[PDB]
Structure formats: structure tokens, C-alpha cells
Amino acid sequence: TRSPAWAQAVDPSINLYRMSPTLYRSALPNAQSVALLQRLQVKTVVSFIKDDDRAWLGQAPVRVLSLPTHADRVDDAEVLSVLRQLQAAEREGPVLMHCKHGNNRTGLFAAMYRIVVQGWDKQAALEEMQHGGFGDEDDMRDASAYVRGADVDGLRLAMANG
């Protein structure tokens, strides 16, 4: 993250980075991450895996939004749905989205958020994804292949027509 527009590191032990005041990006958090999430005022936790976050969140008054998925099966339709839901959650307050390792599934949706929601030019989102310190390229080939393949114009058009 030497580009200032890339996500800013907050807690590397769980691969936690800030994209904005209302959007964070991480790997699987644990019980001792809760205090931090509360200081960040996270109101919603979005998971792209089947693990039940309520197990480590305990009594934290956050909404749990479970969207378990597989990077190698994500399509345009799924992305639009996720981005719409992330956006809606942001309107409620700050959002944490995570997967297992915080770099493949999360890197896919983060990258698509950059492109479709913030209008970044694809190569730029891809560079954040593969070189932002979230992991190495070998960890995220699925995310990479989807992003490389996605029709950004169509996704933007479809996003506007919702």
C-alpha cells in the first residue's frame, strides 16, 4: 500500500485494512478482534465463508450477514447482489467484510467494489488486489481470473438500473 488510495493497514494479524470510514476488509477475525471492531464502530459483519461469526462476536450488537461462496463459482449476478448488500449495509454504519484468509474471496469483492462502486479502472483494482500486501498472486488466481473476465460496463449499467 504505497499508493495512498489503497486500503490502509489496521491489524495485520487478521489481515484487517481500512477502505473507508464505513468499509473494512479482513481475514477470519477472532474473539480478541471484537474490541477493535467496536472502536471502529462496525455495525455489520459480512462473511464469504460458512463459519458462524456469532461464535467469536459473542454479544457484540452487530448484524451478521452471511454470504458463503466460492471464488471459482462467482458470477456477475452474485457480484451485483453482494455489492448492493454491502452498499446497503454501509448506509447502516461501518462494514467489515471477510473470508478465511482475507485475500481471495474478499479480494474479489473488494476489487469489484473499487471498480463498480468507486469507478476505479480495473488494472488499478487488480494492482491493489495482487500487490496491496493482502497475500501473493498464487493465493488468489480465482479472484484474478474473475476480475480479468468481468464486464465492467455491464456491471455498472446493471448497478444503476437497480
Numbering used by the authors: 34 to 195
Paper text:
TpbA is a dual specific tyrosine phosphatase (DUSP) that has a conserved tyrosine phosphatase domain, and relevant phosphatase activities with p-nitrophenyl phosphate (pNPP) and phosphotyrosine peptides have been reported. TpbA (PA3885) from P. aeruginosa PA14 has been reported to be secreted to the periplasm and to link the extracellular quorum-sensing signals to EPS (extracellular polysaccharide) production and biofilm formation via negative regulation of c-di-GMP (3',5'-cyclic diguanylic acid), which regulates biological processes including motility and biofilm formation in bacteria. TpbA adopts a canonical eukaryotic-like DUSP fold with additional secondary structure elements that distinguish it from other DUSPs, including an N-terminal β-strand β0 that caps and extends the β-sheet, and a C-terminal helix α6 that packs on the outside of the protein. The active site architecture of the DUSP catalytic domain is defined by four loops: the protein tyrosine phosphatase (PTP) loop containing the conserved catalytic cysteine Cys132; the general acid loop containing a conserved aspartic acid that functions as a catalytic acid/base; a variable insert that varies among DUSPs and is predicted to involve in substrate recognition; and the α4-α5 loop that is equivalent to the Q-loop in protein tyrosine phosphatases (PTPs).
Native TpbA crystallises with two molecules in an asymmetric unit (a.s.u.), although our results and those of Koveal and colleagues show that it exists as a monomer in solution. The two molecules in an a.s.u. are continuously visible in the electron density map from residues 34–195 and have an identical conformation, yielding an r.m.s.d. of 0.1 Å for 161 aligned Cα atoms. In each TpbA monomer, additional electron density is observed adjacent to the PTP loop that is consistent with a phosphate ion that was introduced from the ammonium phosphate monobasic in the crystallization conditions. The phosphate binding is typical of DUSP enzymes, with main chain amide atoms in the active site PTP loop and the guanidine group from Arg138 strongly interacting with the oxygen atoms from the phosphate ion. The ligand-bound and the lowest energy ligand-free TpbA structures can be superimposed with an r.m.s.d. of 2.6 Å for 120 aligned residues, indicating significant conformational changes exist between the two structures. The core DUSP fold is essentially unchanged, but the largest structural changes occur in the PTP, general acid and α4-α5 loops, and at the C-terminal of the protein. The PTP loop, which binds phosphate, undergoes a maximum shift in Gly135 of 5.9 Å to accommodate the phosphate ion. The general acid loop, which is disengaged from the active site in the ligand-free state, becomes positioned close to the PTP loop via a 3.1 Å interaction between the backbone carbonyl of Thr102 and the conserved PTP arginine, Arg138.
